[PDB]
Symmetry: C3
């Protein structure tokens, strides 16, 4: 897989490279229908047939740091747009007519939308051609199986107010989901990616209850669409970088705020400031463009040179020199300040390194845990090569007398400009004397 990582002592940050993209860029909606019946061991069927009427009753009763820079979307706007078309007159019968001979038919909606309608369960057929004439053991088995799926679908929709996620196997089975993947108009690369990670596909999917009317239960499944695949991705880990003066309250701190996931995307870079919104499966990174910013590709220069003139690297400043650790992909960043006991240990041998005041780093080769104060961090044991890029911490380049003490959404240039405003004021008033 070749996962690599570089730590930067100058900026107290680390970049993990070698990942491949899998970005949710669009949606694939399809209408899923279940035909209903409008109504010895028969006591078993009578009981199961009353669970049926309770599920129909429940369904009809249902319808009567930089994360703040992100936009605001409507996650199920595309799926709900299909439900509202189905509420029109004759639109449900257009589906019920095309699904009279086959189970998977493309019904063009009245507004020119080509939805892939798929009937997955035919209780109308099984109830109207097997039980209304009224004894084999398979008949009670085949009914308790088809009815159990309707009960689970009803169970999820009632507890989730008609919108469920992830999409369960009762909403859409693997045999049916893999059938949709082979029929949607996408690349073979996209089909192979979805087929090998169906659980990730289910977690990024939505199941929206639309309508139950005229012996038909319809709900829209909103499937993810991966329009960006196999592009380079890298994760940026940052930690506070402070000075280490002896007396408390005399130290200045600096933290890069642009941490998160980065993936090359169409000549630009997609930046995901909330790394918790991306799921990692080996070297594949599943993200969602809804939680991303589109930045110029020059943003990658901040990791090698934070003072470059092409991009203005984002930082925040404070005077809070508290100790903590950031567990990276192949190691651990450690910000040790004050009287905190910061160590890195091995399970078989114990403490093998004691960190000094400042920001340091250790790799997972030989290290299993790090301890910062009273917090024990287990490190990731992923195979990969780390590189310790030595350098002077940039916080030493600043004079604490004219240092902007508390900025939350600043940058290297904003700090330098605010320093010049202070130095120019000192310069002009020193001349008065």
């Amino acid at each position: 897989q070749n996962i690599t990582e570089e730590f930067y002592q100058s900026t107290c940050s680390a970049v993990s490279k070698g990942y491949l993209s899998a970005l949710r860029t669009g949606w694939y909606t399809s209408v899923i229908t279940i035909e209903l019946s409008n109504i010895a061991k028969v006591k078993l069927i009578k009981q199961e047939l009353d669970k049926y009427k309770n599920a129909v009753t429940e369904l009809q009763l249902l319808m009567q740091f930089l994360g703040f820079l992100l936009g605001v979307g409507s996650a199920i706007a595309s799926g709900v747009a299909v439900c509202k078309v189905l509420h029109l007159e004759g639109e449900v019968n257009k589906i019920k007519s095309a699904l009279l001979s086959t189970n998977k038919a493309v019904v063009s909606l009245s507004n020119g939308v080509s939805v892939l309608t798929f009937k997955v369960l035919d209780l109308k057929n099984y109830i109207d051609k097997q039980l209304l004439p009224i004894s084999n053991i398979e008949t009670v088995i085949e009914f308790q199986q088809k009815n159990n799926r309707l009960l689970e679908i009803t169970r999820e929709f009632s507890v989730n107010a008609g919108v469920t996620t992830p999409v369960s196997t009762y909403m859409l089975t693997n045999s049916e989901l893999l059938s949709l993947i082979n029929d949607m108009p996408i690349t073979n690369d996209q089909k192979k990616l979805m087929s090998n990670n169906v659980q990730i596909v289910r977690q990024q999917s939505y199941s929206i209850m639309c309508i139950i009317k005229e012996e038909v239960l319809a709900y829209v499944v909103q499937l993810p669409l991966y329009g960006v695949i196999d592009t380079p991705c890298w994760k940026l880990h940052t930690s506070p970088l402070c000075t280490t003066n002896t007396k408390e309250g005399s130290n200045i701190c600096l933290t890069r705020t642009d941490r998160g996931w980065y993936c090359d995307n169409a000549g630009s870079v997609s930046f995901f400031p909330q790394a918790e919104t991306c799921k990692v499966q080996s070297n594949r990174v599943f993200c969602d463009t809804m939680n991303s910013l589109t930045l110029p590709s020059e943003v990658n220069l901040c990791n090698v040179d934070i003072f470059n003139p092409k991009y203005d690297c984002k930082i925040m400043t404070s005077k809070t020199d508290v100790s903590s650790s950031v567990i990276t992909s192949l190691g651990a960043i450690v910000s040790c300040y004050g009287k905190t006991k910061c160590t890195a240990s091995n399970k078989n041998r114990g403490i093998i390194k004691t960190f000094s005041n400042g920001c340091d780093y250790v790799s997972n080769k030989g290290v299993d845990t790090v301890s910062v104060g009273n917090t024990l961090y287990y490190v990731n044991k992923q195979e990969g090569k780390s590189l310790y890029v030595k350098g002077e911490p940039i916080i030493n380049f600043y004079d604490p007398l004219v240092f902007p003490s508390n900025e939350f959404d600043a940058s290297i240039s904003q700090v330098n400009e605010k320093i010049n405003q202070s130095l120019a004021f000192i310069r002009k008033s020193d001349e008065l004397l």
Copy 2:
């Protein structure tokens, strides 16, 4: 329903009107009891009777932007207050005695609390009057049905440490929940609202495990109380408003921070800064006053005039001119800055509008998606009328030389006051020359 929306080009904000309120203002607590038994196809009953003892064993083992301005409540403080009364001596028998003939009896607690006690399952009767004498198929059916509910109730309480939400149908069935709604001392308007949105009621409810003692399992259901209904509500959408100078790093930005839900409430306005804490069902807005601030009604003047003297409109400032979009109720706000490609498209025809640098807006009439950079947003297809209120963007009225560069919790007056402090300093030092 008549949902309307106005966009304000001067402040890069939009207001969606035409909604009706449904605010959770109080709680209705009731004690739910399940009487227990203290102990051919009999092999089916013996198996189901051991699931019974496992559930009893598990139950006894169980008991041995402006969101930061909100207060801090205790969500289940009212329900837990009822559990602690039931732990007193003889208080469980007061319930077990009044529920000896009827299933729904009002037992006045020792501290003057009038709780509506409701026995929903009588396993003590079914086990002590149908199986201890010891073969009909209905007896195995009626026992596997009553026992399955106890197993599900036990399943939810163990995984949730005795506090579950939403309240499932096993905790309280629709027939029992609708019985409680008809018996609680509230308006007919309140009863009709809860009966048509039982799934929303379940999501705003709590189920608290109290005690299992003396053949009685007691748990308190905490139901929502909607003391504010059918008042006007409106949602405010905001987006960053920046200048569009050519060179990077020379632009100033301004964002209204008072976005969220607003509902008229008792001469004041309830403001919900986290719009994700409110659920929209058509034109009804279900919120919770616990996540609200009580503001004067003059706060609505900020949408028409952000420089009014009656209310001080809240804004934040920055120099970060990143592009993004905010999906409104009937359209989309687009903040396009820098080299970002911002478009609005139709599914059948493609790109129909290309946005320029600045803050613009488009309605859902004819537009299905907007693209900002690498992010594709689907717009809501709700029926409604939008109005583009043209105006000069207020960010052009400020001089970047004396602009407060980074404020996170400021207002129009706070910015103007900080500008005067800079202009008065420039004025008095220019006179020295």
Copy 3:
């Protein structure tokens, strides 16, 4: 239990004492294995045996304020480290060989890790010694019971992408979990604590799907380790403290930002800024050191004296004088400002106190609810003694002309230092006249 609480009028804060610690400090990993079969009422077994093959198919398809100051850990790094060892050649057979006679055997891994391997379900034995020879009712019962557990384990892993939490009873039963607690190398105090709060243990546990290969399904259970028990804990509640001038926009506010849980830990204090990450069971406080900072023990002096020279107490400043309430353990803090109607009421008697502008406090003795504006707060009815420590609000000691108007991550000394910079500038320019 002796829960006490002191309110501090000078700083608008309250401390709840009398709690005992239960801190998750490490992890206990163990490998859980399920042996699989590689393949009248027989129609019931044929149906259940096809559910078996569907579960095996699904499993193989699965593998192909101050919170921002916290560090970043990898929660399942220790459990995943054990999965990656099991993927090595012959490592699964080392477990399958040692579990040939007994169900609980310690298999030393190839990297010197001593994992406690535990086989909980033997479907390979039941299928290969009871059904392949092919009619008793118990055989269909004993198979539908063992198979149902595999179906639930498969159900949770598929919807959670192979990592589930809390750990359900199907992943690990109470009889098996209590067996692991008695065998792990910890104190009797630690074993008794886990045995009385198994549901809390399950909520702090992880179940990680490792591998399914060679008729063996292996998944690692990651159990919490409580290395800090029965130490004093206390919770700090804070609320905005503002001036109460008549005209709007002329008031300054001050809020202590160090609210959260505090527990004495190894000569230092573990601070949990997100009190929502700690669970309270009576007087026991279950937290996780991953969400904690390690502060000096002198931090407790801020509650008695916020101007002490030993520790620099953290505060934030603003001009936003909005009303709200903070529900404490034994009472309620009320910040009433402006025209807001703030009251405290009793259920039987109604309003018993009307708050004035400023920050006040009331205890739960006699008070059941407080109302701030349009928000009704229920107070906790925990038994305990409150103490109202009177004092002058510190916000009156500041001159609004030289008050730092908006600081988000500041302290008492940072504010005083920024005031001296303003007073020294006023002093030197007044001399010019």
